[PDB]
Symmetry: D2
């Protein structure tokens, strides 16, 4: 009862996943932050990291342990310690102080994909996890346009995550099945082009955008208010932190993807589009990995009364998502074992803040949780 995992993008999230998982297999900690903890048939010792890819010249060729220790100084070794390999960069790190290298510097995208597939066939992952830098993306919608983009080496059109998910389908087809977990904003689970390519190629997809940070807290409050028929007048959410990833996109890149990165959480939960201010995380270096959040919601109660809630928080970013990933990789192996190719909403609805497919929307997360337990073969919690 094992799961082999390949990581794309060896940064803070990835390194916290690895370091946390090491402590969990070494019993140095309890699985707090891992929702399903030890309830699944796959134990923490049964999760094996078979590979890690990056585009940072400072990381490529280092052992996984050397990079993980840069984020978590207490990690001096790892049970599986593969060397970090070169991926495909496209535009990912163009705005960051990273010296980039990529397969597609010396070959076409189509060639780079075939090269990835060959490498991955030897590493043999069950689950590929995407923790790459946030991207100014535009979805395809039609598979034919994705295929043409690859065929024509259309680098200006594609993002790295789009190329990696494409490669994952080709890999899945050659391997007889695999899973791709997309915890970044780029539409994969929510792009019907990729859901169709996945269904056709023995690939399970979870996505998109890991459910951490302020937005899930806003959504929880909105769910409360909806139940009580309290009319939500406005919602303001502020989120700021010190991770370099928050500077990844130019104002232009943000403008280009805004149509797709805008949250639908408020209308999803309330049923009406209450005015809201929900934006990308701002940058302030000394906060490091621990975000400051501030949320303000005002609403109308009975007899014309008006109430206000102000939520503030300090939340550790990478650990939150790292813990979710411990479940998502094990759930990916279950979905693969069951041949549930395409995207799996019962999983996405709980773990993702933009749950795929495009035709499904966010629900209250307690409801999502109970339905996800049932999908996983567990009894509900309450």
């Amino acid at each position: 009862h094992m799961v082999k995992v390949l990581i794309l993008g060896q940064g803070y999230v990835a390194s916290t996943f690895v370091a946390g998982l090491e402590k969990l297999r070494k019993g140095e900690i309890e699985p707090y932050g891992v929702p399903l903890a030890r309830e699944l048939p796959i134990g923490f010792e049964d999760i094996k990291i078979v590979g890690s890819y990056d585009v940072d010249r400072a990381k490529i060729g280092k052992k996984l342990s050397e990079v993980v220790k840069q984020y978590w100084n207490d990690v001096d070794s790892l049970t599986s310690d593969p060397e970090i390999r070169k991926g495909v960069h496209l535009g990912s790190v163009r705005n960051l102080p990273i010296e980039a290298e990529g397969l597609e510097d010396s070959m076409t995208l189509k060639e780079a994909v075939d090269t990835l597939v060959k490498e991955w066939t030897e590493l043999d992952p069950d689950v590929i996890v995407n923790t790459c830098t946030t991207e100014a993306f535009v979805p395809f919608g039609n598979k034919e346009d994705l295929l043409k983009a690859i065929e024509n080496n259309d680098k200006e059109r594609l993002t790295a995550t789009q190329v990696y998910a494409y490669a994952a389908a080709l890999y899945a087809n050659k391997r007889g099945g695999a899973a791709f977990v997309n915890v970044i904003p780029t539409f994969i689970a929510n792009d019907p082009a990729f859901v169709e390519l996945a269904k056709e190629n023995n690939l399970v997809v979870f996505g998109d955008d890991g459910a951490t940070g302020a937005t899930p807290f806003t959504a929880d409050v909105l769910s409360h208010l909806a139940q009580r028929n309290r009319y939500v007048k406005d919602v303001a959410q502020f989120n700021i932190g010190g991770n370099m990833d928050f500077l990844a996109l130019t104002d232009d890149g943000k403008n280009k993807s805004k149509e797709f990165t805008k949250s639908s959480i408020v209308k999803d939960i309330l049923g009406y589009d209450a005015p809201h201010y929900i934006k990308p995380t701002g940058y302030l270096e000394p906060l490091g990995d621990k975000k400051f959040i501030a949320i303000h919601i005002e609403y109308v109660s009975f007899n014309g009364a008006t109430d206000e809630l102000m939520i503030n928080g300090r939340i550790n970013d990478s650990p939150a998502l790292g813990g979710l990933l411990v479940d998502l990789v094990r759930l990916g192996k279950i979905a693969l074992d069951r041949k549930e190719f395409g995207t799996v909403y019962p999983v996405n609805a709980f773990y993702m803040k933009n749950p795929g497919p495009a035709e499904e929307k966010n629900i209250p997360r307690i409801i999502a949780y109970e339905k996800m337990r049932i999908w996983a073969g567990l009894k509900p919690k309450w």
Copy 2:
């Protein structure tokens, strides 16, 4: 499709219920804050106030409208405008600047009860709502002890709500069925003595303690955290407001009832008794009916990370509960129509912060909501 309602204790909650309901039947407002809004077969025009009782000499003999306007100056008339009648005081207002009068000043408790029953038989309510001053109570547990307390005129042992619920059972028996809604802390739904007396006497009981204020918000956050297996280190809740009721109990009365008024919300939701500070509402006069709340929760996430949430709010007390009551009276008539005597957990679990019976506990309120919709004959919301 009608419901006749009798109110016990004509103060802020009661008067907001009445004033709000008047605007709702007059279409001057939408039913925000009324969870089931217009989904029930009983409409707002079909709720008739047939009586109101108090012990304040300043209120007894006034028209309901004259008292309601003291709380909501915009109310200049009411569709049903009964005169406020004298109840039984026992210790209720002993610590407040209220000149008290009570039936039991001129007769025994047993006589006072028979007098109430005779009055109520002429007013003919379906539903009796208890919005009296908070009480230093001690539950009975065994019906025999409740019966002996009444029989022996044991005024030092009993609170007003205990005497009123007893009277409600006798009334229910003479009438062929009625309902008693207890939105104050005193155990009625959670006192097996009263649940048994109710079952035997054609009385439906909802209780105890209306689910408003800070505690339901704390409970919602705890539910979120539990789902994610986040270990809750501590919970602090502060609540303060300007309502006279917050001064009702002496330090001694508080000490006497503390065993029973202590929240179990934290252990109920989490399954372990995380250290917590959750206390009665403090007094600060200029806040009036709009409470200030402050909640702090710290918890452990993945890889030993520690996060913190600080929730602040300004919430209008009496409107919140007033809106719940618009549903509870209609649900009481449904339970009565169905002959569901004793206490009804599917209702209590959503509307009450100490849901009866004593053998049931709090659950996440979204789960309670969906189960309450099903009980009411509605389709679930999400």
Copy 3:
């Protein structure tokens, strides 16, 4: 002991100033929010509004009262009720849903200025108050460049406030003295070109940017921390509201003026430039005139300990500044009476968040307050 006041830009601030002042002369309210209240020799009845200018075609030609009632419905008349006159628009309202008209549509800037001066000589104000829409400005630094900009009709170079302050100096010279109060961000007090033009032309200038909102609260906390030698690690400030003015500037206009609109409050108060996030107010329509603010500051205390403060607030924008203006117009008449031409730091330091001249900086506002009292001829408060 009188002061005649001319308003430039008849919007929310201006209209709250007028409406508030009307209630103060009519004794309908106490001067809360007016720092010096009734301590000055000029009473509220002695402040006369002699004129109001706008560029909104919907406002030009209306009585002041008709426009004020749009903001404060309780105002049905005014003691002085002049018709709103046409100003100069330049780029002010280009990004707003306002149909603009301006003198410079039919004449050169130099001509428009001479026209303003002639109009103002008949209205005869002592004090001109600038409450116009926020502007993408670039200061001059050298008076010669300001003069050339006017002479050459260089509309692309100038903002309305720059043209109005220029006109104010010419007016002051013809009149024998006047004062210009700049409560918007555009550098006037902090542009040596204008300070020199003012000194030479019998003009007193107060500026720049009224001291209201979140920034003064952040500054107060920083002052506290500085005193205790607490090392400030980071400062994050979020501010959002529903006023149309918050949409006045494009991303480009913001980029153009950012060099000058960036706060120096943190380094001014602390002496070192702690990392900070302090940005323009964001837009969320239902908040209206009542801003939501959120501030987070973390700092190092003794023995390596680290503390955190989270401040949230709801603050009414236009009333705050309206109240300051009641003092600033009276202080302007005192400065004029004393012939203190140029800019007056003892006033600016308390009332303005970028106190002029360019060579002076922010100080703790309690210190500024006591020095401002001394300047005004009052005894200090504590």
Copy 4:
């Protein structure tokens, strides 16, 4: 340029003072949290701990280092490491899980005092610091009543701090001068009996109650609001933490001292007694030494507008006060050198939240700071 210091009560504050001071003399840290840092003529290496007293049987006879390491595990040695000596207990620890021992178990109070004085004459402190458990005290007002209480061995009347301050005066007289720093609530600086005894016996007194925690933050906001003539409607302050000292007083002891422990900060700063809720710190064990605070203030601004501020914080208790003590001991030696016997308001006003003498009150702390710098022979900061 040296100062010898004796500590009364070797708990969290005391141990943080010692541990912090050790790091400061060893250059392992900068003096953050020490307001006057290195501006005084006495450097950190020049502060010598000559003694430490307790009543805990678990601490008496231990080296100072062994006790300090229980609070700060990083401390493995101290430059001066005296054995902890037995004090006088009276009622101090009666409500805590501490096995108490005291001189007055085997002798009268008068004898116990003479014994302390003899011990202290050999240890030879310049400055005695009182960091003992909070006490249910009642001040004397008249010195004659203090003298009679000691003479008559009136243990039920006296607290430990009262006996220690008395002993300090007798010690000061025998030594030719000393200083007593009272950072706990018990009136010493604010009890004219002790101020007179001190003046007569060559004793300098600083007191009372160290200026840390939520109250100084509330006071800072109030000072801001007062300046702007904003009318404060209400002030609510919540403070909770995990230190055992918060359980020191029974409800009865709290009732007995309430007349004296009630804050006057609001009226002191505003000049009118705005309704307020400011209470002793509540207990929640897992918070440890890091308090959670919540403050809510609502106020009236211009034109009838109403604003609200909600401040939340996590603040490390013992470090805050520990840092103040680094200054207070050096300032005590300066006051002693100057023969300024009695109490010194210029010091108290900045460092203490109930600044002595009884005839002086709190002022804005920035004003207190500048006056304290002037007293100390420094130039003001801004």
